[PDB]
CSV table of C-alpha atoms and ligand atoms in Angstrom, one decimal:
chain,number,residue,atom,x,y,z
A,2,UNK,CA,0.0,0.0,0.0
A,3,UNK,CA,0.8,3.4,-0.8
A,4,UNK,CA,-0.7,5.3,2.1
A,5,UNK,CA,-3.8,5.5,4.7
A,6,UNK,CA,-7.0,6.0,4.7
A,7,UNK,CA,-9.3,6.1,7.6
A,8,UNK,CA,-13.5,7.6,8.9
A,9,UNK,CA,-12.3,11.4,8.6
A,10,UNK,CA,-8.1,11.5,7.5
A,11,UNK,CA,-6.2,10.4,4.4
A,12,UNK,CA,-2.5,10.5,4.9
A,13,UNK,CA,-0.2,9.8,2.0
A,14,UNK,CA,2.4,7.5,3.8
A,15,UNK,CA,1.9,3.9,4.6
A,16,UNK,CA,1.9,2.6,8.3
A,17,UNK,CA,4.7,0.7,6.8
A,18,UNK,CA,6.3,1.9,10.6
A,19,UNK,CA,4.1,2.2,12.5
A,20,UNK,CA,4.5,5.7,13.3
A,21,UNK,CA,2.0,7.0,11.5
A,22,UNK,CA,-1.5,7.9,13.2
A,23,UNK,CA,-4.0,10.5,13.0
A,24,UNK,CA,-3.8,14.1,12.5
A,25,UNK,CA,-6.3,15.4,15.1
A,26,UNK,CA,-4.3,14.4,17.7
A,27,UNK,CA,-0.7,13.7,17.2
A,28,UNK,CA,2.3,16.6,16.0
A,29,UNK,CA,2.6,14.5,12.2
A,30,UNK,CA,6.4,15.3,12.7
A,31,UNK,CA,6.5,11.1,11.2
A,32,UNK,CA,6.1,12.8,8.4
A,33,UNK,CA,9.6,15.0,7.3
A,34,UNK,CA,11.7,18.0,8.5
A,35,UNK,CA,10.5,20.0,11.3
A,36,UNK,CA,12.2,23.5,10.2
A,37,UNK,CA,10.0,22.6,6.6
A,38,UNK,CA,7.1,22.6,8.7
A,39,UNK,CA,7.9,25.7,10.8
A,40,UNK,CA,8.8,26.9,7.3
A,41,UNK,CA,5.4,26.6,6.3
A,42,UNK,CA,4.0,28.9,9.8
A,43,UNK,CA,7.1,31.2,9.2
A,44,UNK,CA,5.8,31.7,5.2
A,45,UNK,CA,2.2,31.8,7.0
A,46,UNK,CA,2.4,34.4,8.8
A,47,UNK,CA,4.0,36.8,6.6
A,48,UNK,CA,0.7,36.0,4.7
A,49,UNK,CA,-2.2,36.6,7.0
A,50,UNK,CA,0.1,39.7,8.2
A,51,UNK,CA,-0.1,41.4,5.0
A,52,UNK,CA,-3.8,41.2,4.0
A,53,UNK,CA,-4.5,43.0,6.4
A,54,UNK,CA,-3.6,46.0,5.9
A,55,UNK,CA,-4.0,45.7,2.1
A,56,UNK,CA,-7.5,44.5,2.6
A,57,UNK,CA,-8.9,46.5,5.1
A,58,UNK,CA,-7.6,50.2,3.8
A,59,UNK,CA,-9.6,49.0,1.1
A,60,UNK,CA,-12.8,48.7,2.6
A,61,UNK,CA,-12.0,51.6,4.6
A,62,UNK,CA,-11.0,53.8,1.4
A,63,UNK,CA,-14.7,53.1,-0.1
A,64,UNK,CA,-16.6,54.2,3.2
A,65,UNK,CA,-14.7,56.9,3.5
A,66,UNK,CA,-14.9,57.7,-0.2
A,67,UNK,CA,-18.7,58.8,-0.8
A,68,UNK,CA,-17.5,59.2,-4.5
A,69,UNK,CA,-16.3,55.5,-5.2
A,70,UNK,CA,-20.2,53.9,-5.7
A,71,UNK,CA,-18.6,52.5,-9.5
A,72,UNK,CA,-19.9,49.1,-10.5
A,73,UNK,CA,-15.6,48.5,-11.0
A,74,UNK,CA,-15.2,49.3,-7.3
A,75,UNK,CA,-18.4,47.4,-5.9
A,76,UNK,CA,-17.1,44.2,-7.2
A,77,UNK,CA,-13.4,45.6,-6.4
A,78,UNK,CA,-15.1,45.7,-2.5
A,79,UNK,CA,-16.2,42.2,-2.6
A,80,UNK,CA,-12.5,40.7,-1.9
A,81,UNK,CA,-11.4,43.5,0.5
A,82,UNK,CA,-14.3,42.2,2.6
A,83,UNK,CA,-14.3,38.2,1.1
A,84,UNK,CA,-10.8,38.2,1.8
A,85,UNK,CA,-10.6,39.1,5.4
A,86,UNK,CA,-13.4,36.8,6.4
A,87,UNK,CA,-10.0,34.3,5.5
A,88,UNK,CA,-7.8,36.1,7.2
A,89,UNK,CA,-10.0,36.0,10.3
A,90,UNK,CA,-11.4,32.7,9.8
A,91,UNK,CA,-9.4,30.4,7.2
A,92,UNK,CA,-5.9,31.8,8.4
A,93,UNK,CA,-6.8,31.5,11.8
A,94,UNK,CA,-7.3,27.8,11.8
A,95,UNK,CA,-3.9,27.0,9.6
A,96,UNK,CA,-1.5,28.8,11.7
A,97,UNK,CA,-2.3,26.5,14.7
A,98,UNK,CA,-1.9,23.7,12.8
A,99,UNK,CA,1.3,24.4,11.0
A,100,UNK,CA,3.4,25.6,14.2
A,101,UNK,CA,2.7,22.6,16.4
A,102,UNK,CA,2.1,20.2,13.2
A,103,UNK,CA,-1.6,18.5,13.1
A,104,UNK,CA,-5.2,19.6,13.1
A,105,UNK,CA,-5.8,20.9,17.2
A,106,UNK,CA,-9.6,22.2,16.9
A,107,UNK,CA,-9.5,19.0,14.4
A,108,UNK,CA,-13.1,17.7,13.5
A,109,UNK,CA,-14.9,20.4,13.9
A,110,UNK,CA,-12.0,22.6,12.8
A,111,UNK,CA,-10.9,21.5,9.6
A,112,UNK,CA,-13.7,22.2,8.6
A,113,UNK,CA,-12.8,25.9,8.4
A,114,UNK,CA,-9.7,26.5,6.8
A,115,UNK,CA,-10.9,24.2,4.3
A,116,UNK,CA,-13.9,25.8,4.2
A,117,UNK,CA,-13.1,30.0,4.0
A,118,UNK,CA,-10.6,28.5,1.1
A,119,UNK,CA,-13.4,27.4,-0.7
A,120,UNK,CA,-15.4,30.6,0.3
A,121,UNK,CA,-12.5,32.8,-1.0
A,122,UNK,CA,-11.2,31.6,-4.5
A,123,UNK,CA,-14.3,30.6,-5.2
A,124,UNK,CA,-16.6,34.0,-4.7
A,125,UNK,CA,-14.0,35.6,-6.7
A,126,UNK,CA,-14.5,33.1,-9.6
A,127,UNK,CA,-18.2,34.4,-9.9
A,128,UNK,CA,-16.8,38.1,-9.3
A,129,UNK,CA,-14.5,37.4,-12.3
A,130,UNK,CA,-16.8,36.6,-14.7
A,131,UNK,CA,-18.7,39.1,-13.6
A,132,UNK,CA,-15.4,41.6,-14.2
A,133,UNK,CA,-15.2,39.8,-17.9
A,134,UNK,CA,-18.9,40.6,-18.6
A,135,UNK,CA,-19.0,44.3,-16.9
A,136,UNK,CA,-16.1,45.1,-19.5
A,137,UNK,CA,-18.3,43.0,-22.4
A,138,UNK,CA,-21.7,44.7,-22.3
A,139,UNK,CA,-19.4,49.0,-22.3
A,140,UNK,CA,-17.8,47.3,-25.2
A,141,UNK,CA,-19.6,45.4,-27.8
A,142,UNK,CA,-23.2,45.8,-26.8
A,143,UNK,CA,-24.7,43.1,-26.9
A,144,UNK,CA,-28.9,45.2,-26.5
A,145,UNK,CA,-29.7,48.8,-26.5
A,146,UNK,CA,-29.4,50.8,-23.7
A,147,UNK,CA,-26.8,49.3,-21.6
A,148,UNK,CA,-26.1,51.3,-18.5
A,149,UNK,CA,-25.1,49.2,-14.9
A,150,UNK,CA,-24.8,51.5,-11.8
A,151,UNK,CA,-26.1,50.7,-8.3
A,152,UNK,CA,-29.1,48.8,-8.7
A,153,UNK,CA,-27.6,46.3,-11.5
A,154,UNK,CA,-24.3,46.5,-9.7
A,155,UNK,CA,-25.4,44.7,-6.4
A,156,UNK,CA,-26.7,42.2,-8.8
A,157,UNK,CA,-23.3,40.9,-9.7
A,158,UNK,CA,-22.3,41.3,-6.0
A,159,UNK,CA,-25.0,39.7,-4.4
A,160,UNK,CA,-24.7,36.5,-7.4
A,161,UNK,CA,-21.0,35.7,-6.2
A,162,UNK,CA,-22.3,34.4,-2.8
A,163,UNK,CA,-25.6,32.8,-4.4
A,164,UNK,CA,-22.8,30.5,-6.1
A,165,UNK,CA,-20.2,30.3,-3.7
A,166,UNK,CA,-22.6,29.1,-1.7
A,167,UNK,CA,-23.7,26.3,-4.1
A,168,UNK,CA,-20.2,25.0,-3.6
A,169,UNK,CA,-18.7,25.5,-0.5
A,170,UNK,CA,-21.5,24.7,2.3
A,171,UNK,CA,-22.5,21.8,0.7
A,172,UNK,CA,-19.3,19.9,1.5
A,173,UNK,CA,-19.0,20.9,4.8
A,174,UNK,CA,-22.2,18.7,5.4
A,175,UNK,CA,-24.8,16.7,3.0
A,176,UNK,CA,-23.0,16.0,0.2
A,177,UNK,CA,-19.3,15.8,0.6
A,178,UNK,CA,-16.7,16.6,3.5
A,179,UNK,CA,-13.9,18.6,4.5
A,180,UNK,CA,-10.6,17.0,5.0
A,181,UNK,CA,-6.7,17.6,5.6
A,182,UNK,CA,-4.6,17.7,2.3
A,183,UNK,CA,-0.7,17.4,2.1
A,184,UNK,CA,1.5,17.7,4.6
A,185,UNK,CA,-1.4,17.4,7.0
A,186,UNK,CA,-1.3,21.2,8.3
A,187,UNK,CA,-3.9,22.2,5.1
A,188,UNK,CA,-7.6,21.0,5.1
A,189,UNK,CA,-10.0,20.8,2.2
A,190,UNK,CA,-11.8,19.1,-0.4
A,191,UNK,CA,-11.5,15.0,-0.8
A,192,UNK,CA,-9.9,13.6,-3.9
A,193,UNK,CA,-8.9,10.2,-2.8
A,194,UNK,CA,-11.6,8.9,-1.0
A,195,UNK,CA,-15.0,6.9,-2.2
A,196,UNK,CA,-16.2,7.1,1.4
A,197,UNK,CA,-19.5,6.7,-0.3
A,198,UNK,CA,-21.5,7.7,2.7
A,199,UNK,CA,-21.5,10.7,2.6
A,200,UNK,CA,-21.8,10.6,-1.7
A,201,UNK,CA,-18.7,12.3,-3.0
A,202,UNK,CA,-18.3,11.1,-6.7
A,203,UNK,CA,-21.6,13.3,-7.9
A,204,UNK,CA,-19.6,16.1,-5.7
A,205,UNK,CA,-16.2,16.3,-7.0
A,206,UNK,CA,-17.4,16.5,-10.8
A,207,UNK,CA,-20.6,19.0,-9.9
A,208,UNK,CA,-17.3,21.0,-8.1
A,209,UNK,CA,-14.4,20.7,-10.7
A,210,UNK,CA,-16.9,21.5,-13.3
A,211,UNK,CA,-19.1,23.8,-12.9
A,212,UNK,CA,-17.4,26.0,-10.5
A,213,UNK,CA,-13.6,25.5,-12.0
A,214,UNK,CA,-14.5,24.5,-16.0
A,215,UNK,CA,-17.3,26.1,-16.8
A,216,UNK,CA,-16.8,29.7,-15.5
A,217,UNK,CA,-13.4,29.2,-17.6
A,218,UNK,CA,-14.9,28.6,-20.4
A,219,UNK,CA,-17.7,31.4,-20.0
A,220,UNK,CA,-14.4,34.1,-19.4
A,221,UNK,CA,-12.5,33.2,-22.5
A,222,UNK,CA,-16.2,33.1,-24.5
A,223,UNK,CA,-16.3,36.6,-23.3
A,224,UNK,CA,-12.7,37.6,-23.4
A,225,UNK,CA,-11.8,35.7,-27.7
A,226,UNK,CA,-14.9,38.0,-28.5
A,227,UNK,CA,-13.0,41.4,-27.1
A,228,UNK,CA,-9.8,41.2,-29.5
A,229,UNK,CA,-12.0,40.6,-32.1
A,230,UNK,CA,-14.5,43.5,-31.1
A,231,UNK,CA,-11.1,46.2,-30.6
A,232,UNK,CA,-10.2,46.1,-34.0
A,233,UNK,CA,-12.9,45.5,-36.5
A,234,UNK,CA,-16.3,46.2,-34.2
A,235,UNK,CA,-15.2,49.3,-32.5
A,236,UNK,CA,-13.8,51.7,-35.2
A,237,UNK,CA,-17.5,51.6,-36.1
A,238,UNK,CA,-18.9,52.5,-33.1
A,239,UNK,CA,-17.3,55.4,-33.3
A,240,UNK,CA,-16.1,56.4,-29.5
A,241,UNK,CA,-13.9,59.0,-28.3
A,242,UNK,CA,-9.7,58.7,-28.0
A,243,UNK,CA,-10.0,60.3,-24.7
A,244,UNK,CA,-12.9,57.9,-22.9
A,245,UNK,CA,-10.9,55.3,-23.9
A,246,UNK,CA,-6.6,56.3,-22.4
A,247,UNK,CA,-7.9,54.8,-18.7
A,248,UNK,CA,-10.7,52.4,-20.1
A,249,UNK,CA,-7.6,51.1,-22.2
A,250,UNK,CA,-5.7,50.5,-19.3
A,251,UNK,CA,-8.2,49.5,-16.4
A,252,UNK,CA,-9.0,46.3,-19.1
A,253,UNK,CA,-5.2,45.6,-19.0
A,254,UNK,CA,-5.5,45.2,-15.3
A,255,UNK,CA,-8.9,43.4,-14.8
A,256,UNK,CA,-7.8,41.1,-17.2
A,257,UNK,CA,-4.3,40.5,-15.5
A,258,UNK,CA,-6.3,39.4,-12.8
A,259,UNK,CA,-7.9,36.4,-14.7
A,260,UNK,CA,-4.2,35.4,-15.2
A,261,UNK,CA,-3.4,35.3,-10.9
A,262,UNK,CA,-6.5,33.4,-10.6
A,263,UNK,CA,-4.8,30.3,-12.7
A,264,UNK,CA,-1.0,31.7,-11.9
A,265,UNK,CA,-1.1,29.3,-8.7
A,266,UNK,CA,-4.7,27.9,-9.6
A,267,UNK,CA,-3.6,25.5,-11.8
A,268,UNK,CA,-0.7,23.8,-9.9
A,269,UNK,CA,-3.4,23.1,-7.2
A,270,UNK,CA,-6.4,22.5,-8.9
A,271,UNK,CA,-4.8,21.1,-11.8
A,272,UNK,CA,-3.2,18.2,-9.9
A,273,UNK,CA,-6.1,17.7,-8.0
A,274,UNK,CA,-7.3,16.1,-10.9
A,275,UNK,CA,-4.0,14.2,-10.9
A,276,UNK,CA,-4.7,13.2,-7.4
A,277,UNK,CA,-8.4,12.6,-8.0
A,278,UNK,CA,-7.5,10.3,-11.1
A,279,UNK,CA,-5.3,8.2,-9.1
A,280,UNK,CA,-6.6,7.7,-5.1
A,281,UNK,CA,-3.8,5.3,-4.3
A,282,UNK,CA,-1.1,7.0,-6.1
A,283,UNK,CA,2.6,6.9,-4.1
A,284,UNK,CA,2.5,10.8,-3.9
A,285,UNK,CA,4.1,11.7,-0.6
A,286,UNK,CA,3.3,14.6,1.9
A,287,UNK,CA,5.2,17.3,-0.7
A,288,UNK,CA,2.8,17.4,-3.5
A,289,UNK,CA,-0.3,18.8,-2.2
A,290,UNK,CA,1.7,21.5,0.1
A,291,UNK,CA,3.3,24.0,-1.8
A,292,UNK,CA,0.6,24.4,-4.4
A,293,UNK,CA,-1.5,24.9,-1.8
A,294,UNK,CA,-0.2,27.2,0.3
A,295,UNK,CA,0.3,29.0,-3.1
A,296,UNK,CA,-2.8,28.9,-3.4
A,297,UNK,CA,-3.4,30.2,-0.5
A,298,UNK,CA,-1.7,33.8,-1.5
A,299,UNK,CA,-4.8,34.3,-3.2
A,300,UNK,CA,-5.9,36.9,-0.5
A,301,UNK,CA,-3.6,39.4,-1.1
A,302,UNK,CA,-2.1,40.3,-4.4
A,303,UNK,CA,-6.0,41.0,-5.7
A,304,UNK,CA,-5.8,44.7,-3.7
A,305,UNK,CA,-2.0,44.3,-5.1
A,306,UNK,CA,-3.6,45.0,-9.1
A,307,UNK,CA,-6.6,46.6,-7.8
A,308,UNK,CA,-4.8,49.5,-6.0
A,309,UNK,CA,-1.5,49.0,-8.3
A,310,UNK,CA,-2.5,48.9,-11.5
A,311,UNK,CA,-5.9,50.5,-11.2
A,312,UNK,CA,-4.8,54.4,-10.9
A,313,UNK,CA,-8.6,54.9,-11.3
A,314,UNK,CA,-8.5,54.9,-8.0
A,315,UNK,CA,-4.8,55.0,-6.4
A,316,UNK,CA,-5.7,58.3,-5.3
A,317,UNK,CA,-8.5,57.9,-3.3
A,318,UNK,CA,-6.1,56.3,-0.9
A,319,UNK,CA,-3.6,58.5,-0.9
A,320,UNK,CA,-5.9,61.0,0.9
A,321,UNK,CA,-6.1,58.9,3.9
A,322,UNK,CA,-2.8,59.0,3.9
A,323,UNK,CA,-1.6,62.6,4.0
A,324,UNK,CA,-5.2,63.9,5.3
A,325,UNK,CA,-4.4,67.1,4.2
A,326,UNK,CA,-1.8,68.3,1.7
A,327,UNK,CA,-1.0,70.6,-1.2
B,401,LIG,C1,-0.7,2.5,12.4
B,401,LIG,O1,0.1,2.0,13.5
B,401,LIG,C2,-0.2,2.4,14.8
B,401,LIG,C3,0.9,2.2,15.7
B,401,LIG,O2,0.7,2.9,16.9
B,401,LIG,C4,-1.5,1.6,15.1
B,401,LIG,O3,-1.9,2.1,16.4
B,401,LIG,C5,-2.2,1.0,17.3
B,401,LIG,O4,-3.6,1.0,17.5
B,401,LIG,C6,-4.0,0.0,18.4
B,401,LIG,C7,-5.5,-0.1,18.2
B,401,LIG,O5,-6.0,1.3,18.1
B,401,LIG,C8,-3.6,0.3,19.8
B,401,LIG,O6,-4.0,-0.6,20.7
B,401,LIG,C9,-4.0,-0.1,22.1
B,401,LIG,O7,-5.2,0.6,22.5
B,401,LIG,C10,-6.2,-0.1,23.1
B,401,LIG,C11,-7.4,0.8,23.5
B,401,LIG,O8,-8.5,0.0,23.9
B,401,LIG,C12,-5.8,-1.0,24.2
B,401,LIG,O9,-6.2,-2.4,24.0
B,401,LIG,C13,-4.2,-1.0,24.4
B,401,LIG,O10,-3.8,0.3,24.9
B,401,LIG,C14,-3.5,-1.2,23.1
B,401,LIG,O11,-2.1,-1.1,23.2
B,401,LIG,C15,-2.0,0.5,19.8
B,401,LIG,O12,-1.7,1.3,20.9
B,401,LIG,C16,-1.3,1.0,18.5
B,401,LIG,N1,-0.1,0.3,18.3
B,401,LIG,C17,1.1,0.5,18.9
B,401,LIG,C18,2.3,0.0,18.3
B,401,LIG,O13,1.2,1.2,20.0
B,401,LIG,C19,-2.6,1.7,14.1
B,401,LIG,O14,-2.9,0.4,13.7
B,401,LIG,C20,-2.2,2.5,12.8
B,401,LIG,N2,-2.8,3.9,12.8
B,401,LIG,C21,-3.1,4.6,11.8
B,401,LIG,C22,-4.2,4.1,10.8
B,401,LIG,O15,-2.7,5.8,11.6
B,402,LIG,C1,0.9,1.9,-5.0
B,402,LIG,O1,2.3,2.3,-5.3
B,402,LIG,C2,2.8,1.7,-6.4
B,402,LIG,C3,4.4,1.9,-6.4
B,402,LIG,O2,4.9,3.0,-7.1
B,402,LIG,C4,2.2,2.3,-7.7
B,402,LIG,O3,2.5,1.4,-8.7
B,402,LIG,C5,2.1,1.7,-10.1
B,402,LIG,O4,1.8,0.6,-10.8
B,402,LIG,C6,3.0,-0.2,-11.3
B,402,LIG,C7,3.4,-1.2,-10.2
B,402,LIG,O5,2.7,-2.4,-10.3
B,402,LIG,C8,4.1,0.6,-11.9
B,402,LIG,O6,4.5,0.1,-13.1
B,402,LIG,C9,3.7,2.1,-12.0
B,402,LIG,O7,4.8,2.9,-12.5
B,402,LIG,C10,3.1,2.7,-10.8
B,402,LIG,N1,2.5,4.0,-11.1
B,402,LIG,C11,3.0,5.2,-10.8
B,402,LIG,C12,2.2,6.2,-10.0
B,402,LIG,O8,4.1,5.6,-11.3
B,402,LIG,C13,0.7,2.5,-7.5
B,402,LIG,O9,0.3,3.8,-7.9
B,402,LIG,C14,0.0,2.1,-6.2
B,402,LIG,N2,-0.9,1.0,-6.3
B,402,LIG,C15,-2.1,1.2,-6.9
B,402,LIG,C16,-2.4,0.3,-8.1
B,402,LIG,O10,-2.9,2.0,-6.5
B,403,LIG,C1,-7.7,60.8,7.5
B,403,LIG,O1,-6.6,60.3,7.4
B,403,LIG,C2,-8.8,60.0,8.2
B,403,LIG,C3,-9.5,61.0,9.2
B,403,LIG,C4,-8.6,61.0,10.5
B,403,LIG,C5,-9.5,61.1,11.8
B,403,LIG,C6,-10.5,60.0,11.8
B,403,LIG,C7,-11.6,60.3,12.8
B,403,LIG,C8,-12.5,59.0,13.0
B,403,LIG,C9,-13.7,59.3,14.0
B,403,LIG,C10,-14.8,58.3,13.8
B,403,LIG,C11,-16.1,58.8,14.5
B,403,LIG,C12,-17.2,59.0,13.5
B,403,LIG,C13,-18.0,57.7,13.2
B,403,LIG,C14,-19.5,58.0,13.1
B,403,LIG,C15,-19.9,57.9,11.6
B,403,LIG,C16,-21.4,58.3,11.5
């Protein structure tokens, strides 16, 4: 056998020793190097330290700003706030795992981190296509009179956690389960287990999908159609040099943000299809870890191209900053 399975924990490494056991109660230091796993809580925490302070000056600089009510910023809001439900819930749980080396709150607690991680690059999956469509409708038109604003921009807001929702409750309980990954110091979805209790096959492809797949392909539908509709479609239209210098450049952000999403998006979710293709595979405590602690940087370089290369509205923070200044 390759590794072990038991009623809650997978562990890739067989009990070939006998030192392996369970990860809700024992320090899994069985596995490998201790200064690797204190590696992991030493990368950790300059993570959860720094979307902080990147996330909420950003839902600070929209309250504060009465003139930031843009259907770019209110889906631009959504992470600042997404986001630091993570820090304060999903980072919360990991950091106690990774410094002593096993799952303490376990059970019950798992079923956090994995959870918020399924609850953050997930509700910014259905704000992306959201942020491929918002740039699709002021560009091509696809109707008449196509105007968003307040009304139609909560719309798009409020959708993101009518289909987060879909897919990350669910697992927690009825239809699959959360579950330690890797190294054992990360939780989340199963990819190796029938345990066909609790139903997982219908699950995993209702997950991978329509919430990884589909919204994919219904961004590059949208986003083939836009290179097409700069050169031939739009010097019929007919629209001013001017409008578009910033609506040029706030494109060549938004869509540099689709790129993130797969930049560390793929080596996880990617090979979980590797793993999930193979459930007795002989791949050790390494291969889930980095990607998914890569993975987990998904917090806090959004507000890093948001507030970077979005100038549209680089200076509204600024003016927090100063607070009064020539
Ligand atoms: C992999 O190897 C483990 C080695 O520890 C092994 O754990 C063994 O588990 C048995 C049964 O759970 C324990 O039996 C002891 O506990 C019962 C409680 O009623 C009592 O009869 C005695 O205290 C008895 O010793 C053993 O303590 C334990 N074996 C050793 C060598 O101590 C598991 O089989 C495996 N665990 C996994 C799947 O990770
Ligand atoms: C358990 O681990 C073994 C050992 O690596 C894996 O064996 C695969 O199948 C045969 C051995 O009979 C080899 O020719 C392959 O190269 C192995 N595959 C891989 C991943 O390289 C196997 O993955 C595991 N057993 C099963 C069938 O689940
Ligand atoms: C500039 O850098 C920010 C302003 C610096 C002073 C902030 C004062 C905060 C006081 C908060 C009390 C008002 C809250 C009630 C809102 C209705």
């Amino acid at each position: 056998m390759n590794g072990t399975e038991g009623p809650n924990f997978y562990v890739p490494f067989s009990n070939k020793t006998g030192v392996v056991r369970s990860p809700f109660e024992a320090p899994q230091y069985y596995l490998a190097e201790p200064w690797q796993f204190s590696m992991l809580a030493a990368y950790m925490f300059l993570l959860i330290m720094l979307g902080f302070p990147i996330n909420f000056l950003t839902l600070y600089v929209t309250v504060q700003h009465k003139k930031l009510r843009t259907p770019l910023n209110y889906i631009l809001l959504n992470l600042a706030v997404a986001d630091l439900f993570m820090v304060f819930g999903g980072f919360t749980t990991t950091l106690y795992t990774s410094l002593h080396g096993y799952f303490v709150f376990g059970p019950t607690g798992c079923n956090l981190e994995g959870f918020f991680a399924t609850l953050g690059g997930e509700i910014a999956l259905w704000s992306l296509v959201v942020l491929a469509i918002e740039r699709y409708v002021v560009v091509c038109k696809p109707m008449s009179n196509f105007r968003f604003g307040e009304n139609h921009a909560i719309m798009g807001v409020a959708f993101t956690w009518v289909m987060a929702l879909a897919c990350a409750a669910p697992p927690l309980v009825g239809w699959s389960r959360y579950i330690p990954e890797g190294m054992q110091c990360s939780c989340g979805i199963d990819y190796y287990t029938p345990h066909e209790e609790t139903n997982n096959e219908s699950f995993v492809i209702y997950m991978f999908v329509v919430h990884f797949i589909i919204p994919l392909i219904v961004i590059f539908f949208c986003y083939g159609q836009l290179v097409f509709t700069v050169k031939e479609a739009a010097a019929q239209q007919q629209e001013s040099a001017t409008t578009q210098k910033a609506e040029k450049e706030v494109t060549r952000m938004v869509i540099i943000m689709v790129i993130a999403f797969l930049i560390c998006w793929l080596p996880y979710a990617g090979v979980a299809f590797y793993i999930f293709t193979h459930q007795g595979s002989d791949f050790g405590p390494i291969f889930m870890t980095i990607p998914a602690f890569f993975a987990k940087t998904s917090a806090v370089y959004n507000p890093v191209i948001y507030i970077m290369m979005n100038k549209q509205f680089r200076n509204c923070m600024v003016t927090t900053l100063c607070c009064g200044k020539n």
